[PDB]
Amino acid sequence: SVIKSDMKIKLRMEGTVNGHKFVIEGEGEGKPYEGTQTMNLKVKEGAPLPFAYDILTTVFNRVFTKYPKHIPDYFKQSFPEGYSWERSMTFEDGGICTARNDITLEGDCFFNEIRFDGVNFPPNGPVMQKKTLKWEPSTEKMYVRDGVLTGDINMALLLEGGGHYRCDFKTTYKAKKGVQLPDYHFVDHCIEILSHDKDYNNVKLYEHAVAHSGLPR
Amino acid sequence: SVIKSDMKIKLRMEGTVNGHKFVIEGEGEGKPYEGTQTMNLKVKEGAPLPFAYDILTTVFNRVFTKYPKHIPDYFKQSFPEGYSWERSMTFEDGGICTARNDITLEGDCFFNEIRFDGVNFPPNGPVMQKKTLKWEPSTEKMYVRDGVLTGDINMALLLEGGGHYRCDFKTTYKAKKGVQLPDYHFVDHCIEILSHDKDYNNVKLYEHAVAHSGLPRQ
Amino acid sequence: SVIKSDMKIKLRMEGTVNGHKFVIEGEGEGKPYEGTQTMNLKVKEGAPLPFAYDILTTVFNRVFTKYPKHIPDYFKQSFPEGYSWERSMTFEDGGICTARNDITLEGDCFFNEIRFDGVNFPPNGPVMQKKTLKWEPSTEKMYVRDGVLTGDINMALLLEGGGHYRCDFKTTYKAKKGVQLPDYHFVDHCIEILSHDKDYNNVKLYEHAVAHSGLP
Amino acid sequence: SVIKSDMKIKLRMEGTVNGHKFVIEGEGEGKPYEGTQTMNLKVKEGAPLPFAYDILTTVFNRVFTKYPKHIPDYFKQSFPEGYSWERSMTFEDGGICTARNDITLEGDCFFNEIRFDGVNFPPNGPVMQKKTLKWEPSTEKMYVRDGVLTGDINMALLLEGGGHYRCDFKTTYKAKKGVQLPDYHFVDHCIEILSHDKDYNNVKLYEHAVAHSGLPRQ
C-alpha cells in the first residue's frame, strides 16, 4: 500500500569474485503486483569484469512477485520498514558465492545495499571462461524454518556449446517487523539480460516472478 | 502407441533402511496421457516398518506425466523397450537413500523391479521416529547430460508440529533405445497417500504429474 | 578378550552399480592390535565388473585398527556381540554409493554380510571408464553423535593421467551392546590392491589403520 | 630464504555475518619452519560481535607449517612475490562462509588483506547463540586440481552440551609466480584461543601445523 502499481529501484553492489573487486550501480523500475521489473546496470569499478556477468543477475527483490490472494505476501507486507535477505549459491564445480541485500523504501523507490563474494571458481570453468548464455527459468520452494522465510532453488545456466551448469540457491528472507508468514509455496522465475555491451559495462536486465501453490491433487 | 489411455502397474520393491530389511508389492492403474496413477501397496516382509513410509512413495514412473506436444516425452518414446532410472535422495540431516527401478511393459502392464537402500538416518530424526505427514508438491528440473535425462528436485516432507524436512533428489533416466531428447523443462508433481492402515502395511497411493516449460518472459 | 593377535575374515558382498548386479566373496586374515589385514576376493556373479573395483575396496572392519590405550576402542569392545556399520560415499561428480556391513564373530573368524549400491555414475566418468589407480591415504574424523559413533573422511582416487577424483564418506558404526564412547579422534588409513587379474575377478587387498588424537 | 626463522604478522579483516558488519585488526609473530604462530586480535568496528568468534579464527597463512624436505612447500616457495587463498566453509546446518586472504611480505612482516562473509546461520544455531568451545584438531587433504593447489578439511566445533558442529572447508591457494607443485599430502592443524575478554573484542590466538605424507604403503 506504500507499495504502488509502479515503483522505482536504485542499487549499489560491491563485491569480489576470485579476488577481483568491483562496484555496479543500478537504476530501474517495476510493477510489484505484476511481478515484473527492468533495470539498467553500470560497472563503476573493476571493468572489464573477468567472470560471467550471469552469476550477478539474480542478486540485482521478491517485492516484484505476483502473489495470489490466498498466499501471504511476506515481501509486500514487510514495507514500509523493509527486509533483508542473505543467499548462498553453491555451483556444481565448487564455486561458492555469498550475497546479501538490505532493502529500504524512500518515497516510491527501493534502495538496495548489496554485497557479493565468489570463491573457488575453477580457472577453466564456465564462470571464469565466460561460457554462460542465460539462467533457465526456475521454481523456488518457499518455506518457514525457525520463523525465517527460506527459499531453495535448483538453478541452471545454459552454456555455449549446449549443456547446463547447475547451481543450488538457498536464500533467507527477514522482515524488519512482524508479518503474516506464508505456508509452503512456490515462486516461478524468468530472468533475462535484454541487452548489454561487449564487456557488460552496461546491461539492461528483466525479471518476471509469480507465486503459486503447485499442482493440485 | 503401445502406451494406451489406461494402463496397469505391477511392482516389487526390496530394500533396507538403517539395516531394516523389507519387501513391498504393489498393483495399480493409471492414465499415462493425464499424468495420474493410483496403486495399492502391501508390505510382504519386514512389517511393521520401523521408519517413515513417506521416504518410499516417490520410488513407487514418469510415463505417468502429462507431456505437452512441444516437449519431447522421453518416457513414452522409450516403450516398448522401456527404461530404467536411478536416484539419490540426500536428506538435510545426513540420511542418504539410493533407489532404482527397471521398468518393462508386457501387454497393458508396466512391471517395476525396484531396489531401495537408506543409510545414516539419525535414530531420533523424523524418518526413524515416523514424524512425517506428506511430501509437499514439487517441481523437478529436467535436463540432458551425457546423452540421458537428469531430474533434480528440492523435495520437502511436512512434519508433525508444522516444520519441513528437506531432501534433494537427483534422478538419472535411461531409455533402452534412442529417443528425441528434450530441452531443459519442468515436471510438477503432487503425491498423496490416499489411505493407509495404522502401520502402513496397506497403503493406497496417488500421483499427478504435468510437464511444462516454466514461466515465460510475458 | 575374544579379539586375538591373529584372526580370520570371511565376507560376502552383494550389490548393484549403475544397474549391474554382482556378488563377491572374500577370505583373509589380519592382526587387530597391529591394525593390518589382507583379503583374497573372488567375483562370484556379475563378472566382468563394468566399473572401477576401487569403489568397493573400503567396504571390504575398524577392528583392524591400532588403538592407543588413551582412546577407547569402540570396535574391539563391541565383541563378542559384534557391530554393524552403514556408509554413504558422495563422489564429486554425483555418483552416490550406500554400503553396509553386519559383522559377527564365530570362533577366531569375523563374518561380514555386505550390501553395496551405486547410482548416478556418469557414463564417461572415471568409475564407469575404470580410470582409477588407487585411494590416497586418508585421515578419518571419529566423533559420537546420537550416542552413535560417526566417521567422516575426505577420500580421493588417483586417476590415470594424474588428477584426483574426490569422494566424501560418512560412516555410522553401531555396537550391538553398550560400549565405552571415545572422544573426538582420528584414524589414519592406507588401503592397497596388492595384486589382481585382468578384470579384477581375483583381488588381493591390504589395509593398515592407526588411531590417534592429532597434533598436540 | 626471505622466509626467516622468526617473522611478524599484521592483518585486517573486514566482513559481514548475518548482516552484521565488522573490522578486526591483528598483530602477531611466528616460526615458519616450526609451523607455529601467535596473534593478538582486536575488534575495531562492530563490537560486540553477535556470533561465535571461532568461525573467524582459521581465517586469521600456510607459510606457518612445518614442511618436511620430501614435500615441496608451495607456501614458502611463493615468497617474496607471495600468494592468495580463497575458502568456502560449508556448515552442516546451512551456514556458509566465504573468505579470502591476499598475503604480502614487507621486510620480516607478512601483511594479510582479509574479507569474510557469512550467510544463512540459523538464529538459534550454535554460531548465532555463541555455543562453540573450540575447533578440534584436523587433517587437511592437499592436492592439485587443474593447476590450483586445493585443501579439503572435515572440521568440527566442539559444542556446549558435548556434541560437535561439522564444517567442510575447501581452500584454493594461488602463488603470484610459478612454484614447484607438491603431490597429494596432508597438513595436521591445531588452533586454539589462548585467552579472550568477555565479548571477544580482544583475543590471543595460536596455531600449530605440520605437513606429512600419511600412513606409508606396503
Author numbering:
A (entry chain A): 4 to 63, 65 to 221
B (entry chain B), D (entry chain D): 4 to 63, 65 to 222
C (entry chain C): 4 to 63, 65 to 220
What does the study report here?
A notable reverse single-site mutant (LEA-A69T) involves modifying Ala69 back to Thr69, which ALL-GFP and ALL-Q62H both possess. The A69T mutation has been documented to cause large pK a changes, which is clearly the case for LEA-A69T (pK a = 8.4) versus LEA (pK a = 6.3). Interestingly, LEA-A69T is not photoswitchable under 505 nm illumination (blue), which is considered to be a marker for a primed-convertible FP. LEA-A69T crystallized in space group P212121 with a full tetramer in the asymmetric unit, while LEA-H62X crystallized in I222 with a single protomer per asymmetric unit; both crystal forms were described previously for LEA. In contrast, with a slightly twisted P-ring conformation, LEA-A69T displays the lowest FQY of 0.73 upon 490 nm excitation. The lack of photoswitching in LEA-A69T is likely influenced by the π-stacked His193 that helps to maintain bright fluorescence of the anionic green chromophore. In LEA-A69T, His193 is slightly shifted horizontally resulting in a larger angle between the two rings yet maintaining a closer ring-to-ring distance of 3.7 Å. In particular, Thr69 causes Arg66 to reorient and H-bond to the bulkier Thr69 in LEA-A69T and ALL-Q62H, instead of the I-ring C=O group in LEA and LEA-H62X via the reoriented Arg66 without an H-bond to the smaller Ala69. In contrast, the distances within the internal charge network change drastically in LEA-A69T due to the Thr69-induced changes, wherein the distances between Glu144 and Arg66 increases from 4.4 to 6.2 Å (due to the reoriented Arg66) and the distance between Glu211 and His193 increases from 2.6–2.7 Å to 3.3 Å, while the Arg66 to Glu211 distance shrinks from 4.4–4.6 Å to 2.8 Å. Such a shortened distance between Arg66 and the catalytic base Glu211 (highly conserved among LEA FPs) and the resultant disruption to the internal charge network may underlie the significantly hindered photoconversion of LEA-A69T; however, more rationales need to be developed for the further reduction of photoconversion efficiency in LEA-H62X.
LEA was engineered to represent the evolutionary node that acquired the unique ability to photoconvert from the ancestral green fluorescent protein (ALL-GFP), which was engineered on the basis of ancestral gene reconstruction from the great star coral Montastraea cavernosa. Another green-to-red pcFP named the least-evolved ancestor (LEA) was also discovered to display pronounced photoswitching of both the green and red forms. Several photoconversion mechanisms have been proposed for the Kaede-like pcFPs, and most mechanisms involve a β-elimination reaction and backbone breakage to extend the conjugation between Gly64 and His62 that forms the red chromophore, although the complete photocycle remains largely unanswered.
